[PDB]
């Protein structure tokens, strides 16, 4: 198969109460996910749960999340709440951190086109 269908990026369009949000989702690692929403990037530490849910770390606090796909709806459960969308530092930890990030870039896990090269040079 050609090497442009094995992509690491997904555009997801979710409509909430009339406002359509077009988000991009890629990865910096097997477990490190990057989400572009409203033109802003956020990194999320994601681990797969055996029950189909996901264990997320987004803003320091941890979350257990589930999704249900309907005929025309996406029901996203977080904890005990639901959101329904309509379908249309010590100088030596830094070394290991940035080295792992760059090696992930070398293995094909790279940021999206509009945000790439703004963080890698640093």
């Amino acid at each position: 198969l050609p090497a442009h269908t094995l992509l690491n990026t997904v555009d997801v369009e979710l409509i909430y109460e009339g406002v359509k949000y077009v988000l991009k989702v890629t990865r910096q690692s097997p477990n490190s996910y990057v989400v572009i929403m409203n033109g802003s990037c956020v990194e999320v530490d994601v681990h797969r749960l055996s029950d189909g849910g996901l264990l997320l770390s987004y803003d320091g606090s941890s979350y257990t999340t589930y999704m249900k796909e309907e005929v025309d709806r996406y029901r996203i459960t977080i904890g005990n709440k639901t959101c329904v969308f309509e379908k249309e530092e010590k100088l030596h930890r830094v070394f290991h951190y940035v080295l792992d990030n760059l090696v992930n870039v070398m293995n094909g896990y790279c940021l999206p086109d509009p945000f790439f090269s703004s963080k890698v040079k640093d």
Binding site: A3, N8, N107, G108, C110, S117, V120
Partner: protein, 73 residues
């Protein structure tokens, strides 16, 4: 295949790496030279960016540093 898919971004990072490895230090050991030799033999055009810059290093680290001439003269 997944790694080869993002070869353009890999090329950008590789250029940034080569900029800091053999920049303001006109000297090359017998290990860097082998990597650069293999890297210049990437005849496929998508990797030309990483080959071309590598050749610059292979020719760049054989020049005077302005210190010899300045001091002697």
């Amino acid at each position: 295949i997944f790694s080869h898919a993002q070869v353009t971004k890999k090329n950008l990072l590789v250029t940034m790496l080569i900029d800091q490895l053999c920049g303001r230090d006109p000297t090359l050991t017998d290990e860097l030279l082998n990597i650069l030799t293999e890297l210049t033999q990437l005849s496929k055009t998508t990797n030309a960016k990483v080959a071309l810059r590598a050749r610059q290093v292979l020719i760049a680290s054989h020049l005077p540093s302005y210190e010899l001439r300045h001091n002697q003269v």
